[PDB]
Design a protein around this ligand. Structure first.
Ligand SMILES: [Mg+2]
Ligand SMILES: [Mg+2]
Ligand code: NA
Ligand code: NA
Ligand code: NA
Length: 326
DNA sequence: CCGACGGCGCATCAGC
DNA sequence: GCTGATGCGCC
DNA sequence: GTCGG
């Protein structure tokens, strides 16, 4: 990556603002700048040069000049030495522990992996599982393993009901060589925006995957979204594969394109595209794209028959999944 | 200057 | 119990 | 922190 030092700096700042400062808009600002810089095809020579890019402002330009000149950022150097900031940042690496719980734990004297392990009864279910698999959840998933996981999920889903369609989204669908977790969009013709003609549609699928020992734990689960843990089977004498995060989202079948647009991401691409939609007088979620009335109230869902239809409404040329890794 | 910044599912909790 | 606010998660 | 009105 041409500007890796700068993008790392901005990502670290973003994480600080999110985890410690609890300043969600500064977090988003920093990530937006990191992302636009990441795709810039030149090795940046100055803050001024960077400031030409949408999302990079005066303050980031100044940090960029400091970083280019010295290879570091004093602001970050100090943050890295601050024990409370260090502690809070670490604790938030556990799935289920956010900025608030992290600060609360540090208040109570719980601030290391050892502290967490001996205070399991101070954790909710989600946090308990995040702790259990702390190491595993920070590992990436090789695309080769994602393919094996895809094969199991698609085949087991088929065994439940041949009418289900499961689609692997997230970075996998963007063609990444490695993924952070597995994202599965699920549809069934019994569940549309007009009616739910069959209950337990998501449950049946979760059950089957648990039955074949693919899903190993559950972080949360409702009628349309499952958030849990899974694991590839290993062969005789073979070391086990790491446990992996899996998210499954059941989406009304007639709203598949908005759903797959959403679940394909990236997250920054979605924020950027949805913000552009608003500027264009539309609102996009995982279900529909709707016009904004003169008052700002969302109108009725617009007809959508492809991902491209959505791009057309907001006057964007189509971008294939592989070009949405912002 | 200053309001807006994407949108929503599930878990947990307060107030009634 | 329900409703609404908040935390945390997903892209 | 950055942007647009
Ligand atoms: Mg993912
Ligand atoms: Mg992600
Ligand atoms: Na700029
Ligand atoms: Na966390
Ligand atoms: Na995911």
């Amino acid at each position: 990556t041409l500007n890796g030092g700068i993008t790392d700096m901005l990502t670290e700042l973003a994480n600080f603002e999110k985890n410690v400062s609890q300043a969600i808009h500064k977090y988003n600002a920093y990530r937006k700048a990191a992302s636009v810089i990441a795709k810039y095809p030149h090795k940046i020579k100055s803050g001024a040069e960077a400031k030409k890019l949408p999302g990079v402002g005066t303050k980031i330009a100044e940090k960029i000049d400091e970083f280019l000149a010295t290879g570091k950022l004093r602001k970050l150097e100090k943050i890295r030495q601050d024990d409370t900031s260090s502690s809070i940042n670490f604790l938030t690496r556990v799935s289920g522990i956010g900025p608030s719980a992290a600060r609360k734990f540090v208040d109570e004297g719980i601030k290391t992996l050892e502290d967490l392990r001996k205070n399991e009864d101070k954790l909710n279910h989600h946090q308990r599982i995040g702790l259990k698999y702390f190491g595993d959840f920070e590992k990436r998933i090789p695309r080769e393993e994602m393919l094996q996981m895809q094969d199991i999920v698609l085949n087991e889903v088929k065994k439940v009901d041949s009418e289900y369609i499961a689609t692997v989204c997230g970075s996998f669908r963007r063609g990444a060589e490695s993924s952070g977790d597995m994202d599965v969009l699920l549809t069934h013709p019994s569940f549309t925006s007009e009616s739910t003609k069959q209950p337990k549609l998501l449950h049946q699928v979760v059950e089957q995957l648990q039955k074949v020992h693919f899903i190993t734990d559950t972080l949360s689960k409702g009628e349309t979204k499952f958030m849990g843990v899974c694991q590839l089977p290993s062969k005789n004498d073979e070391k086990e594969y790491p446990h992996r995060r899996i998210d499954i989202r059941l989406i009304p079948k007639d709203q598949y394109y908005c759903g797959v647009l959403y679940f394909t991401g990236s997250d920054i691409f979605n924020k950027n595209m949805r913000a552009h939609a608003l500027e264009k007088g539309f609102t996009i979620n995982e279900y529909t794209i709707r016009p904004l009335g003169v008052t700002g109230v969302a109108g009725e869902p617009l007809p959508v028959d492809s991902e491209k239809d959505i791009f057309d409404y907001i006057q964007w040329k189509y971008r294939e999944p592989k070009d949405r890794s912002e």
